[PDB]
C-alpha cells in the first residue's frame, strides 16, 4: 500500500 518511486536517472 505504497506509492512507487520513479527509477533512477539514466542520464
Amino acid at each position, epitope marked *: *500500500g*505504497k*506509492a*512507487m518511486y*520513479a*527509477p533512477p*536517472i539514466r542520464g
Partner: antibody
Amino acid sequence: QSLEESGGGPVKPGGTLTLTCKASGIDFSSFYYMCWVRQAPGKGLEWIACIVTDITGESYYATWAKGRFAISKTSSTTVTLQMTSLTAADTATYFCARGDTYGYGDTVYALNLWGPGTLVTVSS
Amino acid sequence: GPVLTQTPPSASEPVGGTVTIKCQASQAIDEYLGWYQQKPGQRPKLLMYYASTLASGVPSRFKGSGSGTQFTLTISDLECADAATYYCQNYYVGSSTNYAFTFGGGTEVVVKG
C-alpha cells in the same frame, strides 16, 4: 475531481497562517502527490512542498521552505500548509495542486489538478 | 540542481505563427519534465508531461520535446487563446531524499492579432 484552498488573508510579519486544501470528487485506489505552489504578484511559480497520499505520508520540501513551512494530511480529503515566521517575501497567491505518483510509469506524472489559489499578504 | 532556466524571457508572434520556448535543466533529468500554461489572473494549466506527452484536451499544435538537459515547447498555428506565460517544471521522486519539483522562470508569449 477538484481542489479548493482556504485560510489565506492578511497576517503580520513574524506571524503564522495555516492554509487548507480540500479535495472533492476524488478516489483512493491510486496514490497522489499533493503539493503547494505559491506565486508573488507579477512573479513566477515557486514550488513549496509536496506530500504523498499513501499511509507513509512522506513529504518533500523546497530547501528555502523546509524550516518555516510544514505540510500535513489532516484527512482523506484535506492537506494543510502551516506557514511561520512570515515576512513580506511570503506575500503571494498560494495554490494547491495534485499529480499522479509514478505507478507503472504510465500515469500523468506532473501537476494536472489545480486550485484557484488563496492570497496571503504579510504586512504590518 | 536540477535548476530550470527558460529562454527567451518573452516571445512575440503573429496569429498562425510558431513559437519555440526553451527549457534548460542544470543537470540530467531524463524526461521528467512538464509544461504549464498560465493566463493572467488564472490558475496554471498542465499542457504536457514526460516532456512530450500531451495532456488530455490539449490541441495537437502544442508539441513537447527534449531529454536530459534540453527541452522545448513548440506552439504552432498560434491563436489569441495562446497568449500566456509558460512554465517548465521538474516532476520526479526517486527516493525519500531524491526529488525535484521546481519550476523554470517562465516565458511570456504575446500573440499579435
